[PDB]
Symmetry: D3
Subunit: 185 residues, 6 copies
Amino acid sequence: SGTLYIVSAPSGAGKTSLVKALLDAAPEVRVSVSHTTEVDGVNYHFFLAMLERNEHAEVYGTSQRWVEKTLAEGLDLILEIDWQGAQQVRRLMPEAQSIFILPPSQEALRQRLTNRGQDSDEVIERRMREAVSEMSHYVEYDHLVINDDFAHALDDLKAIFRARQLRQDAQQQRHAELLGRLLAG
Amino acid sequence: GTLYIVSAPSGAGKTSLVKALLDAAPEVRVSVSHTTRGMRPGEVDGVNYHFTSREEFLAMLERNEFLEHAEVFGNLYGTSQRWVEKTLAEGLDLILEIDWQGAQQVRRLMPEAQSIFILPPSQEALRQRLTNRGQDSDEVIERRMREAVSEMSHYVEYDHLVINDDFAHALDDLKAIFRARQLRQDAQQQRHAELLGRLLA
Amino acid sequence: SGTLYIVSAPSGAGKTSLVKALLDAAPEVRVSVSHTTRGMRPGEVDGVNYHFTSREEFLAMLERNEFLEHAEVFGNLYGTSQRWVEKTLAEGLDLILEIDWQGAQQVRRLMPEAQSIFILPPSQEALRQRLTNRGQDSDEVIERRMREAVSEMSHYVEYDHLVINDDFAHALDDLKAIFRARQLRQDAQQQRHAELLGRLLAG
Amino acid sequence: SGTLYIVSAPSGAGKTSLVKALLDAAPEVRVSVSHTTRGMRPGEVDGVNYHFTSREEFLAMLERNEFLEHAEVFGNLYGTSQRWVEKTLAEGLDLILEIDWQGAQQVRRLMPEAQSIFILPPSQEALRQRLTNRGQEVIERRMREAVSEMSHYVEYDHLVINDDFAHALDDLKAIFRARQLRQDAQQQRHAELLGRLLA
Amino acid sequence: SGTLYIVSAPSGAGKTSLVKALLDAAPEVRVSVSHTTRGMRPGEVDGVNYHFTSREEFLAMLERNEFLEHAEVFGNLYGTSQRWVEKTLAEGLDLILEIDWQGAQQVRRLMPEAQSIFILPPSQEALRQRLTNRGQDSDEVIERRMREAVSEMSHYVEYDHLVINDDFAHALDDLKAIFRARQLRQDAQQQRHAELLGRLLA
Amino acid sequence: SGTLYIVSAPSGAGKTSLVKALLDAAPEVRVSVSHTTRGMRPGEVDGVNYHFTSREEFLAMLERNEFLEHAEVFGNLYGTSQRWVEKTLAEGLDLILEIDWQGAQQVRRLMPEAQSIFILPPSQEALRQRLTNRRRMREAVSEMSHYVEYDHLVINDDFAHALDDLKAIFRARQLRQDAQQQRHAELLGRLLA
Ligand SMILES: Nc1ncnc2c1ncn2[C@@H]1O[C@H](COP(=O)(O)OP(=O)(O)O)[C@@H](O)[C@H]1O
Ligand SMILES: Nc1ncnc2c1ncn2[C@@H]1O[C@H](COP(=O)(O)OP(=O)(O)O)[C@@H](O)[C@H]1O
Ligand SMILES: Nc1ncnc2c1ncn2[C@@H]1O[C@H](COP(=O)(O)OP(=O)(O)O)[C@@H](O)[C@H]1O
Ligand SMILES: Nc1ncnc2c1ncn2[C@@H]1O[C@H](COP(=O)(O)OP(=O)(O)O)[C@@H](O)[C@H]1O
Ligand SMILES: Nc1ncnc2c1ncn2[C@@H]1O[C@H](COP(=O)(O)OP(=O)(O)O)[C@@H](O)[C@H]1O
Ligand SMILES: Nc1ncnc2c1ncn2[C@@H]1O[C@H](COP(=O)(O)OP(=O)(O)O)[C@@H](O)[C@H]1O
Ligand SMILES: Nc1nc2c(ncn2[C@@H]2O[C@H](COP(=O)(O)O)[C@@H](O)[C@H]2O)c(=O)[nH]1
Ligand SMILES: Nc1nc2c(ncn2[C@@H]2O[C@H](COP(=O)(O)O)[C@@H](O)[C@H]2O)c(=O)[nH]1
Ligand SMILES: Nc1nc2c(ncn2[C@@H]2O[C@H](COP(=O)(O)O)[C@@H](O)[C@H]2O)c(=O)[nH]1
Ligand SMILES: Nc1nc2c(ncn2[C@@H]2O[C@H](COP(=O)(O)O)[C@@H](O)[C@H]2O)c(=O)[nH]1
Ligand SMILES: Nc1nc2c(ncn2[C@@H]2O[C@H](COP(=O)(O)O)[C@@H](O)[C@H]2O)c(=O)[nH]1
Ligand SMILES: Nc1nc2c(ncn2[C@@H]2O[C@H](COP(=O)(O)O)[C@@H](O)[C@H]2O)c(=O)[nH]1
């Protein structure tokens, strides 16, 4: 069986860039396709009536069907969700692992938001007003990655995922046969 | 700092993997156990072990100076409690290279202790490594091989398992565990308290 | 001249993923685009993953002796174009053939200097799980290939090197070491560093 | 069993330092302690770097057929103990012989499975700098023979160019890891995994 | 403020693939999309590899003084948009110009703090093989570019750093080491860790 | 000709341990054995860690102009032997001087091509922890205030990351025109022939 990961970060901290690089070196890991209001089905399932017909939050929603089958197949799964979703998932599925990604400074956040070139010259300040409040939830997460130097932060992220696959539970499923041979007198 | 328990059947590679880990990790220390085992060729008293006699090991035990002690392969081993208390209080990380009996004692007293079990890729690999090390006779290698399955059966009591097949890959596995812990909420809050404060300011 | 590599594995072992990651760091290496009569998987592009053809046009290409090797694999035909292999090697490029054990045997007979690497899973269940998790094949196809998995893996004894693809990053390093070690052989080093060697022995 | 390696190089190419770094990361690899009829260098320890013996005890050891190979390198005699090599391989350990081209030819005759690696400098002048900068007259005797030593590079399975040390160390590690990935080594090391895969 | 990098190389040395590999691991670094009059080879997208325009639109852009530098390379016009460079450096981003030696000299005059890196092949023949292996140049053009190879490579003396692109991965590491050492300079470390440094001196 | 490096740091920042790890992977690099009037430390060997002499023999060595630089640090005299530096550089080896900011200024005057690196801790308490776990703390801020005088700054937070930073500085310096022109003269000649 696989691990459920929650990855959260303020916009522009580097969560998208770190996860994409993590996936390139981690074939057993998938990323959940959120529904939100780019390619439909790849980045997101791109309305409210279908959503009301059945975690979810306004800041967006995570499809429940994909998660259940994926974990039972042994795949690890990353949810790129906000603190509201993280709280919902942690309540419904307490075994979920949570990782928070933070910038080295508030100004680096603004520079990255501005340098990404996807938001407006005022939405950067609109998102920054909520950025300090959003980052305050870092205390609710199992691990913290400070995305200063990208390469080091990628290593930090890979170490979390590798250490997790080395846990007792994961090693028992993946290396069951080796463990059996080791104890076979 | 963090207290680590590293255990393994005799000859899995626990000593050599930890030695290499320390070369890149000055903030981590390894505890020097007391033993009544006889010195191996190439071993130095005070570095690898505190080589003491049985009468004084038991004298040290009667003074309750041991955080844990156990009988392993017919010899007495124990961890000095004073050295552990001071080392953790200075902020250094600390590795105990002890058996499952010591591991259980330590886990009861310090539930936050992190435990790692190192496994060989096969049983025969243990005998080969014990033989290739060349520090132990055949009577000792055959005594430890009989208990090897018994030693490995406690692996289910450990937080993480490292399979020491290829040395460099297993060192990477080990470094990933130590790095993931240093990235936990508690460690990150202590280490980056000032940076975190500026972020919420 | 470049080196011809044969990379084989039971379906779902990770051979395509490992080779793709190898190529991102290895510009001197090319991978052969095989012909197949199989239908496309979701996300496959004609000319990139395979040259998709009909049975008829495959057998016509075969009657013209345009295949270095060919084989029937899980009910479909696959084959390596001979012209492309010859031209690439003569340019000094290294070349990977991602082919089955039947094709590998044909290539070894025609080109004895070819290097072969076999990629094994850590378990049989790992193959089924990886085939299922890739999501490009149906269930009947997966079961059909899993039925032959033990028979397929039995040919590992015919290969020069074995890579156990347990941890992907570790298996990628193992693969890079085989390639890097081949480029350090006497022949490759003599061709690539002919001038430096000449400077070294001149008094 | 393990792999027998022959590592050769003109004096000062970096063979000892590259092997030392390789040994620090490769516990399954041992390096042979050769016998020599030579005087220690500042820092050398008898039994670690060499078995320092006289020319009398060397030829007597030779007459007893105790050497796997022997050769004269600058009038000084060097040789590898056959007992030590035979014992180490049978335990499954890999073994490095740091010997010249003469020993390599002898070992290749007795053990065709031996792997040979020749370590080259980026230039002839870099050889002089490394010989001089290390800190052990002989350089002029060895530099005349350096071209002679390097000309035998054509006899070796692999060539490592020791230009940048770290890159040359990676090159060296790639050879050793690729060798452990060969059919024979993998068959011994993962016999149990292979059995489960075919069952 | 970010750092301006000039990366140059004779055709086929490996400059495009080495920078592409460096960028995949370095999000704080951007590469300038030059304007060119050359024809759009397959696989290239206007706005991705180049801003493909005609000679007429290029010279009109030049008359509007919208280029930081421009040069004729192998009969076509190439140029770096000055507005994009100025804004990108002012945002604190690092910037690579993959330009020839002519553009590099122009950039050095207007921006003497620009960092320049020259990439070299391990041999002239390796250059010919790589041009042939890339498969995007007639044999006539290859023979012509090899005639200019020695003249082009002679400009290596104008560059701060030389990377010999022999083994790709080793040359990629060399390049990353240059970039990492630059971000460790007094000025860069002072800007990025100004607050941490303040805590140290209190 | 090799490169002369100046590596400085407040006491306990990690300069000696980082340089030791760098040297294990850099055989072309040497570290200068300074003269000092301080007494031997745990495990210190005369000629290895320092050339331990007395204040009287140090000042005599100074009057003979045998030093490249000298300074009083924390109440003890320290100095670099000039002959060893000159010979080492002329042999083509790179050279590290583990000296304080006073020595760094003297060396920069005599050899302005010297590369200087300052190693900083992640926090002021980390120094106390590193010094304690392994008087100077009051002067630590004073020593660190000279960081502005150095070409490169390495923040020794995570040891392995700081080691990588240090290796990148040394590797980039060997990628400079002057260094590459000396080291690959024959290759460059072959390319331009
Ligand atoms: N460590 C880093 N240093 C500098 N820029 C970075 C770093 N990591 C990411 N970036 C850049 O910051 C911007 C925001 O990153 P992104 O992952 O898209 O944000 P988000 O956290 O909202 O998913 C991008 O342009 C990215 O390239
Ligand atoms: N992955 C490995 N492969 C082969 N030999 C190894 C490996 N790891 C360690 N060794 C060797 O096995 C022997 C036993 O290792 P050691 O750490 O001393 O055992 P222990 O687990 O009892 O502390 C040593 O000679 C060591 O060098
Ligand atoms: N070591 C691994 N662990 C888990 N999944 C892996 C590993 N290597 C590859 N995979 C995944 O297994 C699936 C099958 O891999 P692929 O290379 O396409 O198979 P094939 O060997 O048939 O070419 C893919 O989804 C791939 O991402
Ligand atoms: N790649 C290298 N570049 C520069 N100096 C090196 C390199 N490798 C080794 N050296 C140095 O060259 C000298 C000769 O190395 P050594 O291993 O002792 O020589 P040998 O090849 O004769 O065994 C030593 O001082 C060593 O530190
Ligand atoms: N070190 C290398 N060894 C072999 N081939 C390489 C190396 N680096 C790049 N190549 C290949 O050489 C060709 C030319 O590289 P490219 O970057 O496109 O050239 P340019 O220098 O003109 O930008 C490409 O096919 C590339 O994959
Ligand atoms: N990054 C680090 N994190 C934690 N401890 C470190 C780090 N780097 C070095 N140390 C330790 O700090 C102590 C002081 O290091 P050292 O190099 O001896 O100091 P100095 O800068 O005075 O030469 C040593 O015990 C060393 O192992
Ligand atoms: N709760 C929840 N948050 C999501 C989901 N998908 C994205 N988000 C969050 O929505 C925020 C805005 O992201 P963006 O606007 O770039 O798409 C991010 O913080 C992201 O983590 C989802 O499925 N559920
Ligand atoms: N409980 C306990 N076990 C120890 C201690 N020191 C070493 N051991 C264990 O004793 C066993 C025998 O080790 P050896 O004789 O090879 O040194 C190993 O499993 C080792 O981990 C100690 O202080 N306490
Ligand atoms: N003989 C041969 N086998 C091939 C060729 N191309 C693919 N195969 C093999 O056919 C099998 C099925 O591959 P698939 O349909 O999953 O892509 C794999 O083992 C693959 O290596 C080819 O050109 N020749
Ligand atoms: N044939 C042979 N050569 C040796 C032996 N030991 C060292 N050599 C070679 O003797 C030469 C001189 O080495 P040195 O004097 O620096 O130790 C080197 O080329 C080294 O490889 C040995 O046992 N046999
Ligand atoms: N001066 C200048 N040269 C450029 C520019 N863009 C590309 N080049 C150079 O033009 C040459 C031809 O490149 P290509 O035709 O392969 O894209 C290369 O040397 C490349 O570095 C530019 O904006 N300015
Ligand atoms: N100027 C100068 N400072 C030195 C020299 N050797 C050591 N130091 C500095 O003296 C200080 C005290 O170092 P320690 O007492 O731990 O050896 C350190 O900052 C060290 O850099 C030297 O030769 N010259």
